[PDB]
Design a protein around this nucleic acid. Sequence first.
RNA 1: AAAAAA
Length: 565
Amino acid sequence: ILTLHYSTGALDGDDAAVITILKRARILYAGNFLVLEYKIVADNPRFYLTMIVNPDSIPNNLASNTKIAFQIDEYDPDNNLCKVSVQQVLGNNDDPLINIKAIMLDNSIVFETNDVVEQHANKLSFDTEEQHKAYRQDLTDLAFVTVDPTTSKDLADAIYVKTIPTGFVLYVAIADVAHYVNRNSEIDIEAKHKTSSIYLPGHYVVPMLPEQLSNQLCSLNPAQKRYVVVCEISFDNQGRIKTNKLYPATIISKNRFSYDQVNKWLNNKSELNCDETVINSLKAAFTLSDLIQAQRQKRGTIDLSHKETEIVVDEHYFPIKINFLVHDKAETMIENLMVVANETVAWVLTNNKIALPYRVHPRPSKKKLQSLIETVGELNITKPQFNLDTVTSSQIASWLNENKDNPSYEIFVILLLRTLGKAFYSVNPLMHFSIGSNHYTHFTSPIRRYIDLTIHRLLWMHLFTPDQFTDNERDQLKQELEKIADTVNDTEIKIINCERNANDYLTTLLLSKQIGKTFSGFISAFGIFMRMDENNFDGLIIGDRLEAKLSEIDFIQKRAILTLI
RNA sequence: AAAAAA
Ligand SMILES: [Mg+2]
């Protein structure tokens, strides 16, 4: 497969020369239509072919500067000519939301509503008798709550924590999505294709499941009875796990909190209008969370936190400003409880000899570490003493920790993450090196990740109600696990590229209003990249500090051009 | 290109 000598019409993802194309990476391409003589300028700057537009594919009244998608029906290798045909009209080429949808199309990400799938979803309802199953514990009396970003309408997890003399009991209640979505149903097939929900700025979301499930029937909304799968974990007073149980349950969330509300309550800047049972559960949750964090740091875990930003857009999808995100205390509390549930479920399935898709992150090779050691040692970052074949999560963490004061610590973490590589899903039991566990999976987010849905299905079919499934049903799912992991892994790459394309588009749209401003920053990486302090975005012209002026936006390549003072 | 909620 080919990545973009310059002189046989092959494209990205389809010394040597290309002889033939076995399979195109794409069938549709986004572009701007211009007008009589017709032209298309592809959105992707790596689309280098000259295009002859078929007039019979163009509605007669379709005007210039309209975003379209086109396909190649045939091509001619002797003249570097290609024929293209218009397949979709998307809208005005200057509209930022239209550009975001074009970016999705260019990354092969479905975003248009599937009328067949929504009609199936509108047929679903709340079965009142499910709560009376002998296997489903009625927990509707417990003061569960949800803590999420203010704008989310998909809330998959609720928590309740009780203090006991010997320690703590944690209840992590996860929406019972497998109860509503039958395997190989129309809804399931569409979810498996998407593999996850998509979150773009302005809270524009492409949901893995349609809204009546993701935001209503499975969303653990306040004051609603909801069916869940509970991970219940008992801890000692040091935060060490003693026992665990998994089981289906029924809950009623008592409150829907935002991270912002909980964090301000933490700093005594405000108060929560809720029952004292909720207050006491939150207090125990934070106490338990600090203990869990201390235990995980003791056993080994790599904090790869670094600068992150989000782009705020208005109601018409025009960008307003860039915010630096603050993974604060309340967000940290939720993450600690979700990780311990995820880790526990991984071990339960493993202990029971049930094949599952793990979330894995292998130890990096000695060679890659050596290359990294060479690159960074040049940059006032200590040289580590550990053995490179045997290096533990703790040793990487200690190396980062003893450099927390280096002025270039930010760029250090970036290169280590690449050296470490991408996490992925695998049925083979590989470690998660940065989390610090030998077994890990994704269990807590089945409304928005297909892997979590699969994990719930495995629990139901093997542990909760094995009698309602056949050995051929269990083997049918087992045989598919590696293909599910592959599809999710392949699609995750596309989703990451789509968000990156979209953030570059919106950030440069915002910066195009700011030719006239000077910026400070350092170098992140044909030329010098400079990352501006105010927006965390790299302009084009490692670790040196610089100051520079914004001279132009390159809209072809979606890049910011800077000039040295 | 890690984790978590989205
Ligand atoms: Mg949540």
